[PDB]
Amino acid sequence: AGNKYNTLSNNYALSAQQLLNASKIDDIDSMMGFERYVPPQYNGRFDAKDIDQIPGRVGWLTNMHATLVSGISGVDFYFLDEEGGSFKSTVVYDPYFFIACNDESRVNDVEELVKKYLESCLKSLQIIRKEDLTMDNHLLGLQKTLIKLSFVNSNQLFEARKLLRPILQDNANNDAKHLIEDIREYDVPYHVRVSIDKDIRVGKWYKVTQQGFIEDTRKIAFADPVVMAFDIETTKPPLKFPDSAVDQIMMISYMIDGEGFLITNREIISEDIEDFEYTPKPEYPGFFTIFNENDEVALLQRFFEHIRDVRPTVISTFNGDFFDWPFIHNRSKIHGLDMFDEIGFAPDAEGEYKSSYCSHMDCFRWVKRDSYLPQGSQGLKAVTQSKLGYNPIELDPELMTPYAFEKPQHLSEYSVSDAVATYYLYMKYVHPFIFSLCTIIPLNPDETLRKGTGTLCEMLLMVQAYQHNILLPNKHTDPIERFYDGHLLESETYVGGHVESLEAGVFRSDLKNEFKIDPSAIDELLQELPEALKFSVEVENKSSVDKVTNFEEIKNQITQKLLELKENNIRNELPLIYHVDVASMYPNIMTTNRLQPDSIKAERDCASCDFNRPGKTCARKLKWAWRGEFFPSKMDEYNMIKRALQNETFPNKNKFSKKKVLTFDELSYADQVIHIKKRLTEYSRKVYHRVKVSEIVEREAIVCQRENPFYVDTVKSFRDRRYEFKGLAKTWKGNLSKIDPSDKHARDEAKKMIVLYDSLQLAHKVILNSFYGYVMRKGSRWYSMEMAGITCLTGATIIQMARALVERVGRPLELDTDGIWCILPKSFPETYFFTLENGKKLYLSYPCSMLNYRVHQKFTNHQYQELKDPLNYIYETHSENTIFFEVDGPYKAMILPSSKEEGKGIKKRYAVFNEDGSLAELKGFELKRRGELQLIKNFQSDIFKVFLEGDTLEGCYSAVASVCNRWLDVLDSHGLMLEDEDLVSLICENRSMSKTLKEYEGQKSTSITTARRLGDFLDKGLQCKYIISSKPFNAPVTERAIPVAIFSADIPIKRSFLRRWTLDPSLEDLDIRTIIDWGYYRERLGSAIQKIITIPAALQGVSNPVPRVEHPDWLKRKIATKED
Amino acid sequence: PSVDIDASQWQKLTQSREKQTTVITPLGMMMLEIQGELELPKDFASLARRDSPNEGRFSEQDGETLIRFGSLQIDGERATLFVGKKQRLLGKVTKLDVPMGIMHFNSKDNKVELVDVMKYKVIFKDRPLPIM
Amino acid sequence: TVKIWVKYNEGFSNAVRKNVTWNNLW
Amino acid sequence: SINLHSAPEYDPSYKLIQLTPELLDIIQDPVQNHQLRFKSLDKDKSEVVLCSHDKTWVLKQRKHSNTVLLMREFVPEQPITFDETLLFGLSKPYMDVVGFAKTESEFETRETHGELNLNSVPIYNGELDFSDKIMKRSSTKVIGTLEELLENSPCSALEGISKWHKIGGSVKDGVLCILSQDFLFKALHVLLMSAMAESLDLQHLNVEDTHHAVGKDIEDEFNPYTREIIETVLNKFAVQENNTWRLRIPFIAQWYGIQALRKYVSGISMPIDEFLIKWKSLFPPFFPCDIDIDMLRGYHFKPTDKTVQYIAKSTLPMDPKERFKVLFRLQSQWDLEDIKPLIEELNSRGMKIDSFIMKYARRKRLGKKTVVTS
DNA sequence: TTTTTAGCAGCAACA
DNA sequence: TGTTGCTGC
Ligand code: SF4
């Protein structure tokens, strides 16, 4: 009894500090034009149909943030607004959460207890009712009784949580206190709460009124915000990374709405730069006006002044969360400028740069999450090449600081190139994508850009659960340990997507392949043909057979081709190279089977349900494959390890505690299990000679069909809206071509909206495929590890069923989860058109429709139940299935690599070519990667196009082998040819270090050796350009890595370091060719030749086309045993 | 300041001579683009004299030391350029999207003369190989 | 005598457009 | 095969210029007076343009990172035989080419509006005996004839004559000049009074009859309305074509409205009705024209919705934000067709007017009108 | 403190 | 020869 007075004072102090920060934000917002608009009083009848008589002001909500108002919690909403430059408005709303009771008869005893226990922080209390999908018989309208606790602000809500958590912990471990079951909805972010509970969304238009925000629909197009995009050039030391403590800003390049600007620091930049044009395409203009400023502080002041003048509501950068803004802010602090009081920008709790009025659109966040680019193509140049379809200017980072004095015009051309690349990357891709996501997600642009996709699914599901009055579950907490057969689980999961590599080789539309058709598969297909064609009209094309004039003509044409393939079942003819892939596979399995985490019921919850009668159809049973990884050790051995650890002593992790040492039982239970797992890994390895066992167990779960439909309705509805936009897209495509060609005739509004619907299409797309993932989002809500296993095993069963047909009528090459790559005979029944009485043609792909018909006969849900009458709880039962293959192709060529191991393919690696010879799709491979060995990139650039040459598979591999031999001649001749500097570059291998410093005092290797050798010779991001030296003989490759910059150095310096690095004091020859390890480079290229060519042909049984690169000994044995 | 482009001679020669048939114009012109830097000696008169007579790799023509730096063999669209003893370049004859034009600024008389107009170019985009 | 070669640039680069002055020509 | 040789020294005079299809058509035209000409205002600062006889392109050099060698065919002065090296696929040598130039850039041509360089051209206000005044000032620059001016201007002949006529260029006593706004419109006013006083066909005017009509009863030494002045007024306020002039009547009325704004209502915001009455009364009798304060405001600004006041576009800032600031200052709330000619000067980016409008100032609508505030 | 999932290639170490 | 780690698909 001795601290009750010191907690109240700190919360008033924190609320005053938050009000003082809110005042500073109001001052900054007003400077930037975001004056706080308060709408006129209106005592009239509220109807949203008469909005134009409705009072206040209409605007599009561009930016929203949580604030504390004179403190009361509120959200400020920033409206790019129509017409106006901008204006903010505030919605106040009480933060709240719920208490759950175990006995609904004594809720009033809990009410009196919590009124009296929370009196210091509670604003108001109310008893409410919500649907809880974990409650027995909620499907009869039974609702859980809940105590709503409301607060004046989010700080008082947090104190109520601190007071209640001890009672929940006492109740769980060990009176009206024991009637408190749990707290619910206590962890929803406050701005997300206001956005959901008021249905306000960024990217949407609203009228701000006294009653709240009213959404507007007469306006689907976005407003045009003022968009700034910037980049910065800094000094740096040779071979190191710029340090904001010592290095200066040389230049800041930027674009505002399509005008270009450059600020230069004339302490560093040697000449005055004149106004110039950088237009890399006619669709990307860049006129640059130049501000030649005297010093770094004038450069910073000009940059902050120009931001205040143009009032950008978006600032975009490339990686500026982690370089640009950190640098500007540290340089500003060295010069005594406060960047928050100058322009409203500060680092948040994550260290990311944010303001109130202006959203920070780091393009690199979208590149990492949404661009679908592999991590090797996520640097600005490779994004510009892959998205904007030009090469930006490229400068070596080691030449930047020299070129500020020697060639500053060429440094300014580089800097404006990266501003142009960033601005047009933002405007063409990031802008329409993020603001489109905001129209549906209850988040601002900054959070919508930066949160993980499974958190975006969580927000969408929280909107839908709130709208249906469902009670949100608390966030799933993984159990700290689990056991299986008395063994400690290291991890548990399910069997995921099925993947097979069936063949390896070159397959070409102009080279012949052998086919061995199963005549019984053609008999099945001939017997299925009438219903498969009817299914293509009725289900795929949503038409009636009675409207189809040529149905029997198409049937007879397919029947003839099938009969000829039945009689001539062994053929050697040209292939059709096809990809067949399931449209949105996991989402469609989920909608078809009514899979949610709201239904997976136990035998208990199913037995407690009043719909559980004799004859029940609503209990759909589905299989999944669980997979444990556990320690070989048993429960007695686990207990022996625990007793051994209880005799040990542990360091206290809490730096604020004076107690340096803890016992085992004084550790947190998570820390206890970390120490147990460590000693069990050692014990298991010592006693059982293995650390883990893995086991796969087939399990069954009950999918309720009668359970409240909110999850699946979100998926069905979202799927239909996306289809809607694909349709609208097509109608718009017709509109963009039907009309006249005067491009500027008030139809550039029509094309932006085309980008817009495309973007809402891609948006629903990501959201759907994400729901599909979210559901295994550890720590998220609505988690459902099961459901995920059913979805994967059902998918694996569908794709194995499809493969088993394709293997009987053609040859499947690769299978990955939802897709099959195959070759069919060129005589196979392919594409047809049904003719309707109205002259419209419906599309038929027989290889696709034969699979879709079999999917519908085997995987349809005849148990799907939907709630027809919500007053009487009447359910209808129908047949649901949305699982369709799509077809892509035919393709010109496909190339599949083989393993060096006997009988083993290489999965998820292939190259595919279109009929025009363009590269359609690739898998694995290098080159596209940052750094790597330049020889292998140049070899890969040459080789891929040459797979389009030759009329047979052997001819194709022979053309490819010519290029392989030419690249072997360059190495076998010791590259004495060409120029020395060129040899350097190609041989060069480049590697970037993440953060040098102590990560680097840390590990040691080739780059680590190159970075240390650059340090010996001449911070974060360093490009280790190196070659591998022949000397010292028998030394590890990591000690033979020589930096290429030594070859351009003075002969005495070059001699001293080459002698020291080769361990040859007598080294007098300094030619690069006698230093190089040609054997190492010959093995690197030979290993590329094995993976990309020798394997394909030799794996398919064609003789080895590059004999100068031998096959692995397993593959030689596999060929010899295949020919015997 | 201001100055005219004189294009009368090229125009008269163009109208009086047939259309361009191969990659070389009737007046005997060719361009060339290399993805790289052509590393040549900094001096030539001294080095042209030590080249043995049999090779003739550094010849003298009208008082100017010309270096014989390669050979070109055109096979349809394909083209190959041999450089020195150790370089082989594979390339192509491509039709120019924008017909290039070479001109000539006579600083002496402040006259500008149109020299010729291109339509094709010989490009070499792959790393040089030995001549074999 | 055999010291003529091309130092290969790994990728084709086209530089920034520049304005032209009278002195740029002469 | 052809042997490729290189000289020790290249001629840097040879440069590469991109030739667009249109340039090719121009290039293959023997008809033209002037084929093509490089033009620049000065030697060290201004841009360089390429001009045909009727169009102008601005030149932009674009550097590249490659080695580009142009080879010309040559006939070796003495027979030269080369040794065969291990080179495969070599036909007999039949001609010889030498790389004579190494170029690092191309000259791109972008279409732009030609403008006259009016640096040393003085302003003429109709002063008597102006020949004396041209030596009262020290103008070293000499412009005898207009062709010399066009020759030293960055524009084509047709563009030059069009712009020269548009800005009211003339020549007095053998000295090239630019007429003041006041005296030009005064000469127009007297001319129209004489033309309608003699019942001349306003659609078929010639120089001699009108010139005779204007200077009939005034002394020649004090009659500034010379024949060249007549040619300027006709080429400014009429369209020619045996080529005769026909008056641009709506254009004349518009000019007259600009004159009225600059003389009488440039300091006060008069109600539109009184200004239209006085404006109407200033014309020479029976001149056929109707009017709208619509273009009157397309020309000035409106302090309130029913008044008009003159504004000259030349006095407006070139900084966007400042010009928008001063525009919002002239009238807190602005119309539309009223604000469009006021913002034309800020960004040639060809945009939706509303775009830059909001960019600085901001739009706000109501029932039918859209005004502009902040 | 915020955080979708599983299946697979292949380099390199060591059981 | 197999498992295990890590990066990156
Ligand atoms: S199967 Fe039927 S009775 Fe059982 S829980 Fe589901 S809806 Fe209720």
Q: What is the 3-state secondary structure (H, E, C) of A544-577?
A: CHHHECCHHHHHHHHHHHHHHHHHCCEEEECEEE
DSSP D359: H
* Cβ within 8 Å, pair A934-C11: no
- In this structure, the answer to whether residues D223 and D163 fall within a common structural domain is yes
- In this structure, the answer to whether residues D33 and D58 fall within a common structural domain is yes
Helix locations, A810-925, DSSP H = 846-859
Distance CA A870, CA A141 (A): 9
Query: Cβ neighbours of residue D199 under 8 Å, at least 6 residues apart?
Result: none
Indicate the top mutation candidate among A611, A622, A867 to test ligand 1's pocket, ranked by most ligand atoms within 8 A of CB: A611
**Which residue, A185, A146, A140, is CA-closest to A707?**
A140
> What residue numbers bound the domain in which D239 lies?
123-247
Looking at the complex, report in whole angstroms how far the Cα of residue B62 sits from the nearest Cα belonging to chain D: 7
- In this structure, the answer to whether residues A969 and A1117 fall within a common structural domain is yes
* Cβ within 8 Å, pair D107-C20: yes
Residue D296 lies in a domain: no
Method: cryo-EM
- In this structure, the answer to whether residues A836 and A922 fall within a common structural domain is no
Distance CA D294, CA D317 (A): 24
- Residues in chain C within 8 Å Cβ distance of B69: 4
* Side-chain half-sphere exposure of A577, counting CA atoms within 13 A: 22
- In this structure, the answer to whether residues A921 and A960 fall within a common structural domain is yes
- Rounded to 5 degrees, φ, ψ at A693 are -115, 145
- Do D91 and D1 meet the contact criterion of CB atoms below 8 Å apart? yes
User: Residue A164: in which H helix or E strand, if any?
Assistant: helix A154-173
Q: Which of D76, D111, D146 is the last residue of a domain?
A: D111
Find residue C18's DSSP bridge partners. D61
The span from the first CA to the last CA of chain D, in angstroms, equals 73
CB of A1117 lies under 7 Å from some atom of strand F: no
Residues recorded for chain D: 374
Find residue A17's DSSP bridge partners. none
Contact A598 CB / ligand 1 (< 6 Å): no
Query: Cβ neighbours of residue A1052 under 8 Å, at least 6 residues apart?
Result: none
- In this structure, the answer to whether residues D89 and D173 fall within a common structural domain is no
Residue A234 lies in a domain: yes
- Do A349 and A342 meet the contact criterion of CB atoms below 8 Å apart? no
Query: Cβ neighbours of residue A583 under 8 Å, at least 6 residues apart?
Result: A884, A885, A886
- In this structure, the answer to whether residues A299 and A405 fall within a common structural domain is yes
Distance CA D185, CA D258 (A): 10
**Which residue, D264, D352, D344, is CA-closest to D308?**
D264
Distance CA A850, CA B100 (A): 56
- Do A1084 and A1027 meet the contact criterion of CB atoms below 8 Å apart? no
Distance CA B130, CA D321 (A): 63
- Do A225 and A313 meet the contact criterion of CB atoms below 8 Å apart? yes
Specify the number of domains making up chain A: 6
- Do B92 and B62 meet the contact criterion of CB atoms below 8 Å apart? no
Do you find a cis peptide bond into A890, omega within 30 degrees of 0?
A: yes
CA-to-CA dists, residue A843 to A304, A540, A574, A837, A1036, angstroms:
59, 9, 24, 15, 61
- In this structure, the answer to whether residues A74 and A113 fall within a common structural domain is no
Indicate the top mutation candidate among A616, A703, A873 to test ligand 1's pocket, ranked by most ligand atoms within 8 A of CB: A616
- Do A692 and A505 meet the contact criterion of CB atoms below 8 Å apart? no
Helix and strand element counts for chain B (H, E): 2, 11
A990 vs C: CB within 8 A: no
Helix locations, A323-452, DSSP H = 324-334, 339-343, 363-369, 380-383, 397-406, 408-425, 431-438, 445-450
Q: Which of A411, A439, A467 is the last residue of a domain?
A: A439
Distance CA A761, CA A436 (A): 9
Which residues of chain A approach chain D closer than 8 Å at the C-beta? 33, 81-86, 224, 226, 257-259, 277, 285, 309-310, 744
Here the tokens at position D24 are 């090719």
A945 vs B: CB within 8 A: no
Angle at which helix A397-406 crosses helix A408-425, to 10 degrees, equals: 130
Residue type, D215: G
Here the tokens at position B96 are 């120019």
Radius of gyration of chain A (CA): 34
CA A59 centroid distance within chain: 32
**Which residue, A286, A251, A243, is CA-closest to A268?**
A251
The tokens 């850009």 sit on which residue?
A449
E strand intervals along A469-557: 483-484, 487-494, 499-501, 505-508, 513-516
- Do D69 and C15 meet the contact criterion of CB atoms below 8 Å apart? no
- In this structure, the answer to whether residues D87 and D137 fall within a common structural domain is no
Q: Is A593 helix (H, G, I), strand (E, B) or coil?
A: coil
Query: Cβ neighbours of residue A950 under 8 Å, at least 6 residues apart?
Result: A508, A510, A511, A956, A957, A958, A959
- In this structure, the answer to whether residues D239 and D129 fall within a common structural domain is yes
Find residue A255's DSSP bridge partners. A229, A260
Neighbours of A718 (CB within 10 A): 21
Residue D233 lies in a domain: yes
Residue A754 lies in a domain: no
Looking at the complex, report in whole angstroms how far the Cα of residue C12 sits from the nearest Cα belonging to chain B: 6
**Which residue, A707, A712, A144, is CA-closest to A464?**
A712
What was the resolution (in A) of this experimentally determined structure?
Answer: 3.6
Q: Read off the CATH number of the domain in which A107 is found.
A: 3.30.70
Residue type, A908: K
DSSP A71: -
B48 vs C: CB within 8 A: no
Q: Is A861 helix (H, G, I), strand (E, B) or coil?
A: strand
- Residues in chain C within 8 Å Cβ distance of D108: 17
Burial of D277 (0-12, 13-18, 19+ CB in 10 A): exposed
Q: Tell me the pairing of strands A989-992 and A932-933.
A: antiparallel
**Which residue, A1087, A1112, A1019, A1027, is CA-closest to A1061?**
A1027
- Residues in chain D within 8 Å Cβ distance of B7: 27, 35-36
Nearest to C8 among A278, A409, A982 (CB): A982
DSSP B36: E
- Long-range contacts at A370-375 (CB < 8 A, ≥ 24 apart): A370/A433, A370/A766, A371/A429, A374/A928
Residue D14 lies in a domain: yes
Residues recorded for chain A: 1124
Q: Which of D90, D111, D132 is the last residue of a domain?
A: D111
The tokens 């058709």 sit on which residue?
A517
Query: Cβ neighbours of residue A854 under 8 Å, at least 6 residues apart?
Result: A528, A801, A802, A805
Residue A811 lies in a domain: yes
Q: Tell me the pairing of strands A874-880 and A249-256.
A: unpaired
Torsion of CA A766, A769, A770, A772, to 10 degrees: 170
Q: Read off the CATH number of the domain in which A356 is found.
A: 3.30.420.10
C15 vs D: CB within 8 A: yes
Angle at which helix D249-264 crosses helix D181-197, to 10 degrees, equals: 130
Distance CA A485, CA A503 (A): 40
E strand intervals along chain B: 2-6, 29-30, 33-34, 36-39, 58-61, 64-75, 78-83, 87-95, 100-106, 111-117, 120-124
Q: Tell me the pairing of strands A88-92 and A96-101.
A: unpaired
DSSP B57: S
Query: Sign of torsion, CA A523 A524 A525 A527?
Result: positive
**Which residue, A422, A403, A64, A349, is CA-closest to A208?**
A64
Q: Tell me the pairing of strands B33-34 and B120-124.
A: parallel
- Do A198 and A61 meet the contact criterion of CB atoms below 8 Å apart? no
Distance CA A142, CA A133 (A): 10
- Do D5 and D98 meet the contact criterion of CB atoms below 8 Å apart? yes
**Which residue, B80, D135, B126, is CA-closest to A939?**
B126
E strand intervals along A52-159: 57-69, 72-79, 88-92, 96-101, 124-130, 144-150
The closest nt to A907, taking CA to C1', is E8
Distance CA A43, CA A631 (A): 71
Residue A478 lies in a domain: no
Secondary structure (DSSP) of D126-189: --TTHHHHHHHTT------SHHHHHHTSSS-HHHHHHHHHHTTEEEETTEEEEE-HHHHHHHHH
Distance CA B72, CA D150 (A): 49
DSSP A652: -
A986 vs B: CB within 8 A: yes
Helix locations, D265-339, DSSP H = 272-282, 293-299, 320-330
The tokens 């090469």 sit on which residue?
A391
Find residue D103's DSSP bridge partners. D68
Here the tokens at position B93 are 């004859």
Torsion of CA A911, A913, A919, A922, to 10 degrees: -20
Q: Which of D58, D89, D111 is the last residue of a domain?
A: D111
* Side-chain half-sphere exposure of A499, counting CA atoms within 13 A: 10
- In this structure, the answer to whether residues A146 and A68 fall within a common structural domain is no
The residue whose C-alpha atom lies closest to atom 7 belonging to ligand 1 is A706
Neighbours of A286 (CB within 10 A): 23
Residue A396 lies in a domain: yes
- In this structure, the answer to whether residues A292 and A377 fall within a common structural domain is yes
Find residue A260's DSSP bridge partners. A255, A288
CA A651 centroid distance within chain: 39
Find residue A78's DSSP bridge partners. A63, A88
Distance CA A714, CA A768 (A): 9
Query: Sign of torsion, CA A281 A284 A290 A291?
Result: negative
CA A603 centroid distance within chain: 37
* Side-chain half-sphere exposure of A1106, counting CA atoms within 13 A: 29
Q: Is A990 helix (H, G, I), strand (E, B) or coil?
A: strand
Here the tokens at position A613 are 């009668």
Here the tokens at position A209 are 């009124």
Specify the number of domains making up chain D: 3
| Residue burial D204-218, b: 16+ Cβ < 10 Å; e: rest | ebbbeebbebbbeee
Do you find a cis peptide bond into A1032, omega within 30 degrees of 0?
A: yes
CA-to-CA dists, residue A748 to A284, A736, D344, angstroms:
16, 10, 20
DSSP B100: E
CB of A557 lies under 7 Å from some atom of strand E: no
Here the tokens at position A384 are 């510009």
**In Å, what is the separation between the CA of A598 and the C1' of E8?**
32
Secondary structure (DSSP) of A317-340: ESSTTTTHHHHHHHHHHHTT--HH
Residue A646 lies in a domain: no
Distance CA D269, CA A497 (A): 78
| Residue of D10, D11, D17, D103 for testing the chain B interface, max B β-carbons within 10 Å | D17
CA-to-CA dists, residue B127 to A942, A979, A1079, D122, D326, angstroms:
10, 10, 20, 63, 61
Distance CA D336, CA A303 (A): 33
Here the tokens at position A706 are 């009668």
Helix and strand element counts for chain D (H, E): 13, 15
- In this structure, the answer to whether residues A237 and A338 fall within a common structural domain is yes
Query: Cβ neighbours of residue A564 under 8 Å, at least 6 residues apart?
Result: A827
Residue A601 lies in a domain: no
- In this structure, the answer to whether residues A1090 and A968 fall within a common structural domain is yes
Residue A856 lies in a domain: yes
Here the tokens at position A29 are 């917002």
> What residue numbers bound the domain in which A813 lies?
499-586+790-891
The distance between the two most distant Cα atoms of chain A, rounded to a whole number of Å, is: 99
Here the tokens at position A700 are 């069954």
User: Residue A805: in which H helix or E strand, if any?
Assistant: helix A785-809
**Which residue, A297, A305, A295, A246, is CA-closest to A269?**
A295
**Which residue, A665, A620, A625, is CA-closest to A642?**
A665
The span from the first CA to the last CA of chain C, in angstroms, equals 35
Distance CA A1048, CA A278 (A): 32
Helix and strand element counts for chain C (H, E): 1, 2
Domain boundaries, chain B: 5-38+70-124
Find residue B129's DSSP bridge partners. B88
Angle at which helix D207-214 crosses helix D181-197, to 10 degrees, equals: 100
The residue whose C-alpha atom lies closest to atom 1 belonging to ligand 1 is A619
Find residue D205's DSSP bridge partners. D245
User: Residue A117: in which H helix or E strand, if any?
Assistant: helix A107-117
- Rounded to 5 degrees, φ, ψ at A115 are -50, -50
Radius of gyration of chain B (CA): 18
Query: Cβ neighbours of residue B52 under 8 Å, at least 6 residues apart?
Result: none
Residues recorded for chain C: 26
Q: Is D215 helix (H, G, I), strand (E, B) or coil?
A: coil
